[PDB]
Write a sequence for this structure.
């Protein structure tokens, strides 16, 4: 078991 | 059979000049993972994470 | 530098320390989408 | 032109039953050896 | 019998499923309940399915949601037959548990949350005879027998007979020995099967033999057996006939089957899921009663059937099902459209279904059997493409888990007209033609050709050979694809995009009906559930904002009204009155309006004047330059309700408080996050949770935010056109027509040939004509069946009528019909080319790694990459984490930074 | 509290045990070092 | 990156000494990548 | 010229309330509780 185991915003055109 | 033999030779040549003993493959003692690496947020009112 | 050649980014010999492998991988992978 | 000659070697290996004690065994004020888990319940 | 003359209800599937469940499944599961016989000296009983009484809920629906309790119905059965040894029947009505009830719309309220049950598609038990391609020799014909549980038993055929089975681990399972061990005599075995020469030359009961009810029918249909329907066990004659058909297909006498055919697949509904859950709950109840009997005999006390049974298993099983099952999903209450299109979904994935990546590419494509039964347009985009589909409008379950479609007989029979529902397998054998009879070429009118569909193939045949005929316009499309006007002039990709965007619509403050519509918004608003329909006939004697009183034959019925409630996805719900006081009403007519509905029709947007032209590059990409009139005239204003000095004595924020980002109301005190500010309309103290405890974990608060249309918002039409607002301009700066009115929105024209949408121009022109003529249009799809170029005539006639009745010659100009010359707002000069002018129906939308490391390494910014990695992570922390995780498994790591000056090794930890 | 995140523990075992991927896996280094097929050693373990 | 099971087992058995002359090696370590501004000499 | 299919079938009055008791609408959907209580599938609290 051990082996096996900024702001996002829309963009517009200016 | 000859491939097994060549692999055995290659495995045996390493242990002579690598300071790693072959009897360490068994676990006479087991390490324990640190607590924060394990999932533990907090303990409140007998809660166990 | 001489075995690789000219870089299409700036237009001269490749500068020392430029990751040509990542650039090649990306330039081969990105056309596969279209 | 001589390079800066930076040298870093990351080595991997299998631990020994003697080296494993160098991680968990710590000193105490009274001097008793500690580092072993002997109780099943943690909380 | 309903649905043959009109469009069926959108919630009839789940309605009839729940009815069938509560009618037969409960009794079917109680019949298979085992009998526990013990407690000799004590008085007990068994499970007798004789009472079977369900009691109405004490709580009401409104109450349940308010207090977060499930709405459910009690179950009281008097299961008493006879005692163990007392020889006296002790019958007591025991309370087994609670069974959830379904609303008329299909939603069940569990723990205060509206939840729906989505149907599932899966293969049916039977034999299929797939011809697997073989590299050497003839093609190997393997026949797979599917059972009710899901077992697979194959039979292979090599160049020789080589009749072997794949049930065993080895390739050869000795099918001859398997048939001999079944109990049939060898002589009878070789005499029953046809072609005994190759048979003589050739030298489990838990789930495989347990075939379902539909499996026996499918096996009797595919094969030639006449086994009665009561038998549901795999007989040896079945395997004999399977081997016979396989060895016959080896010689060329046979026909392969397609697993993508709807006749080979079965549709599960809420009834089957609830029946399985009830069976599991009954199993748990039997285990519990056995345990408590073993405990009561130990404690040496005569128990009571009331104290012997516990109401825990049923309740906990239904709760776990409604909470953790993939099919059970919460209702989407964004707009009245998502409420009706959520129950019509079909899911290929789920328990006992094909996964996402495991599913082959042949399952996702459209099949000729999906016509009129599954929508070819609606498809969930993403990795789960083709696996989530929508049920067609004219479709129902056909008593065998098969979805059927209506068809009209055009044969010279006794009746001559009968709307038949055809199973996907039975419809293939008839000639189905969708074409008009407006053709005459000096013949009897029956010798004329018409495109028809036969044996999953399209062909043109005479009018004498056609048997069936499809006459409904909305027969092949779902709710979303039907609400698109002029769908014949758009591609299917944009139809899918529009069907997806119509779900993401926001109910605005004031709603307006569309000038150009498809005619299905009426039934959509009827089946939505947000409209108050009358349950009795009578006069309206008292009209008020809170309730409506309807007086019929002496009895007075009170009807509440939703006033500024919150949905599941932050959308306000409100109902307005539409009937004055003192008028007569009938059952089924509207008494009060609803959100996103006006006059009994779906209203998800407003009508705005739109021009298609490039404007200073603000719409180079998909972008819209709107006018400022939409901001101060309250056109695209909407409400949103979110739940979580102004603090009172107790600490809760009082009503009417205007919270701001950073203000606290009740870490210790809850604070409003960034971007959330509005009026606190109401606060409720959840002192008692209903989670079986009184948990004042927190007090629910509601804030109202009236979001005006601003830059960055996404506006979309019903034809796939999508645009992001780029700039707001005053009324004086927008382009103005020859009448003197400034346009509201400006769209880019270059998108029209890119996304292949033509219906938007028709919609704009017809909406302008209707706005000038004060008319509304409801057009059925595919109007070209009447005549060629029907939409052109329909649009141009109305345009010319609006131009001649009202003296506006700029509306219809003969030189370029549908286009008009406009002016510039800044300089007042006309553009050198005409532009499209119209009033379309615009909707407001709700939505407003390793590759980066590879790119940064390609640029050569090592310090920026190091800073980004240290910011994302926080010797570094990642190295310590990795070395700890590796040494937890007996693995040692060292950095060993070697110095090049003095030649010494320094370990860094 | 980073000392707690960096500190580890150790447990003594009365009977020795063998690594997971040193034996069961297809490359059996112990079997290659002991000149004996996997059947007997699996048995001893 | 692919096996993560035997590539570590054989490496720990051989006692391999790895010189950080790659990119993703230093990325996983956390130091400066010897590409571009990091490439000295 | 004039279309073959009459346009009057498409024209709808703007200020018009849809009458759902029409030839092109299904029967009113009754409440599930009342529908199942009339047919005898569910018994009331008093009668129980
Ligand atoms: Zn058309």
């Amino acid at each position: 078991n051990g082996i096996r185991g900024s702001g996002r915003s829309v963009i517009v055109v200016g | 059979r000859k491939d097994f033999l060549v692999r055995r030779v290659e495995l045996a040549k390493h242990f002579i000049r690598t300071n790693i003993e072959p009897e360490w493959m068994v676990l006479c003692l087991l390490p324990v993972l640190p607590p924060e690496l394990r999932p533990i947020i907090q303990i409140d009112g007998g809660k166990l994470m | 530098r001489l075995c690789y050649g000219r870089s299409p980014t700036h237009g001269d010999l490749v500068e020392l320390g430029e990751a040509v492998g990542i650039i090649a991988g990306q330039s081969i992978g990105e056309p596969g989408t279209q | 032109m001589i390079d800066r000659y930076k040298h870093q070697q990351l080595r991997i290996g299998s631990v020994s039953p003697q080296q494993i004690s160098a991680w968990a065994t710590k000193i105490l004020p009274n001097g008793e050896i500690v580092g072993e888990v002997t109780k099943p319940y943690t909380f | 019998n309903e649905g043959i003359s009109t469009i069926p209800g959108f919630n009839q599937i789940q309605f009839e499923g729940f009815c069938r469940f509560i009618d037969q499944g409960l009794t079917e599961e109680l019949y298979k309940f085992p009998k526990i016989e013990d407690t000799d000296q004590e008085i007990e009983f068994q499970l007798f399915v004789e009472t079977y009484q369900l009691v109405e809920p004490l709580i009401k629906e409104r109450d349940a949601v308010y207090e977060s309790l499930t709405y459910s119905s009690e179950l009281y059965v008097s299961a008493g037959l006879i005692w163990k040894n007392s020889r006296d029947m002790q019958e007591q009505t025991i309370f087994i548990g609670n069974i959830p009830l379904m609303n008329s719309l299909g939603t069940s309220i569990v723990n205060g949350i509206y939840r729906i049950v989505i149907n599932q598609i899966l293969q049916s038990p039977g034999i299929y005879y797939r011809s697997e391609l073989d590299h050497n020799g003839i093609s190997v014909y393997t026949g797979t027998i599917i059972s009710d549980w899901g077992g697979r038993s194959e039979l292979e055929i090599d160049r020789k007979a080589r009749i072997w089975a794949r049930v065993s681990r080895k390739q050869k399972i000795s099918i001859l020995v398997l048939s001999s061990a079944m109990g049939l005599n060898l002589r009878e075995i070789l005499e029953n099967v046809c072609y005994p020469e190759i048979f003589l030359s050739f030298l489990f009961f838990q789930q495989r033999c347990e075939l379902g009810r539909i499996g026996r029918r499918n096996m009797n249909r595919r094969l030639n057996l006449d086994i009665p329907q009561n038998n549901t066990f795999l007989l040896p004659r079945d395997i004999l006939a399977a081997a016979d058909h396989l060895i016959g297909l080896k010689f060329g006498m046979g026909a392969l089957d397609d697993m993508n055919h709807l006749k080979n697949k079965r549709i599960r509904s809420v009834a089957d899921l609830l029946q399985d859950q009830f069976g599991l709950a009954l199993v748990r109840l039997e285990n519990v009663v056995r345990g408590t009997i073993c405990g009561a005999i130990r404690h040496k006390l005569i128990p009571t059937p009331q104290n012997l049974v516990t109401s825990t298993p049923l309740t906990t099983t239904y709760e776990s099902f409604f909470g953790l099952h993939p099919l059970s999903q919460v209702l989407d209450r964004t707009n009245p459209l998502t409420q009706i299109v959520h129950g019509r979904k079909l899911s290929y994935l789920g328990p006992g279904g094909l996964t996402g990546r495991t599913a082959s590419f042949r399952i996702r494509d459209i099949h000729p059997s999906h016509y009129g039964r599954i929508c070819p347009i609606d498809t969930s985009e993403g990795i789960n493409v083709g696996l989530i589909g929508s049920l067609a409008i004219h479709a129902r379950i056909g008593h065998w888990g098969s979805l059927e479609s209506p068809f009209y007989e055009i044969s010279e029979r006794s009746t001559g007209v009968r709307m038949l529902y055809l199973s996907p397998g039975r419809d293939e054998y008839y000639m189905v033609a969708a074409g008009n009879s407006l053709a005459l070429n000096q013949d009897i009118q029956e010798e004329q050709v018409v495109p028809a569909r036969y044996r999953q193939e399209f062909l043109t045949i005479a009018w004498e050979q056609v048997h069936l005929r499809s006459i409904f316009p909305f027969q092949y499309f779902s709710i979303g694809a039907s609400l698109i006007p002029f769908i014949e002039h758009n591609d299917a990709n944009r139809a899918l995009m529009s069907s997806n965007m119509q779900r993401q619509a926001v109910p605005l403050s004031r709603s307006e009906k569309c000038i150009v519509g498809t005619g299905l918004e009426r039934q959509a608003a009827l089946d939505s559930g947000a409209l108050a329909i009358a349950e009795r006939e009578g006069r309206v004697v008292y009209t008020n904002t809170d309730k409506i009183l309807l007086a019929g034959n002496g009895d007075i019925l009170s009807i509440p009204l939703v006033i500024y409630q919150r949905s599941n996805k932050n959308t306000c719900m409100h109902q307005k009155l539409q009937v004055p006081r003192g008028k007569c009403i009938k059952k089924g007519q509207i008494l009060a309006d609803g959100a996103a509905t006006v006059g009994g029709e779906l209203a998800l947007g407003k009508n705005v004047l739109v021009a298609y032209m490039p404007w200073e590059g603000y719409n180079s990409e998909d972008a819209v330059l709107i006018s400022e009139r939409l901001v101060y005239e309250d056109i695209y204003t909407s409400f949103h309700i979110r739940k979580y000095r102004n603090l009172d004595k107790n600490g809760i924020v009082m009503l009417g408080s205007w919270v701001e980002t950073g203000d606290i109301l009740v870490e210790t005190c809850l604070k409003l996050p960034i971007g959330g500010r509005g009026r606190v309309i109401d606060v409720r103290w959840i002192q008692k949770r209903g989670g079986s405890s009184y948990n004042p974990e927190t007090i629910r608060v509601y804030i109202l935010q009236k979001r005006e249309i601003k830059v960055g918002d996404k506006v979309a039409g019903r034809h796939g056109n999508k645009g992001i607002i780029s700039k707001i301009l005053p009324r004086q700066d927008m382009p103005y027509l020859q009448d003197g009115r400034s346009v509201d929105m400006v769209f880019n024209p270059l998108g029209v040939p890119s996304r292949m949408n033509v219906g938007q121009i028709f919609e704009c022109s017809l909406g302008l004509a209707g706005s000038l003529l004060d008319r509304h249009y409801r057009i059925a799809p595919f109007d070209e069946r009447y005549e060629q170029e029907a939409s052109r005539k329909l649009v141009f006639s109305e345009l010319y009528e609006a131009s001649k009745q009202t003296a506006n010659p700029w509306v219809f100009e003969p030189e370029y019909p549908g286009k008009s010359r406009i002016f510039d707002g800044r300089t007042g000069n006309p553009f050198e080319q005409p532009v499209i002018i119209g009033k379309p129906y615009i909707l407001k939308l709700i939505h407003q790694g390793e590759m980066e490391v590879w790119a940064l390494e390609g640029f050569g910014v090592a310090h920026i990459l190091q800073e980004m990695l240290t910011y994302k992570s926080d010797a570094p922390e990642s190295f310590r984490l990795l070395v700890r995780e590796l040494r937890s498994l007996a693995l040692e790591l060292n950095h060993f930074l070697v110095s090049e000056k003095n030649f010494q090794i320094n370990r860094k930890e | 509290s980073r000392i707690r995140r960096y500190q580890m523990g150790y447990i003594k075992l009365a009977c020795p045990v063998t690594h997971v991927w040193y034996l069961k896996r297809l490359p059996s280094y112990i079997a290659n070092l002991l000149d004996k097929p996997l059947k007997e050693l699996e048995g001893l373990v | 990156f692919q096996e993560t099971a035997r590539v570590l087992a054989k490496a720990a058995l051989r006692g391999r000494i790895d010189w950080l002359k790659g990119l993703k090696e230093n990325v996983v370590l956390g130091g400066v990548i010897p590409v571009g501004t990091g490439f000295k000499g | 010229g004039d279309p073959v299919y009459p346009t009057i079938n498409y024209i709808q009055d703007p200020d018009e309330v849809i009458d759902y008791r029409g030839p092109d609408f299904h029967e009113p959907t009754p409440n599930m509780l009342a529908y199942l209580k009339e047919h005898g599938k569910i018994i009331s609290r008093e009668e129980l």
Remarks:
- The pocket of zinc ion is lined by residues E 486, 488-489, 783-784, 791 (CB under 6 Å).
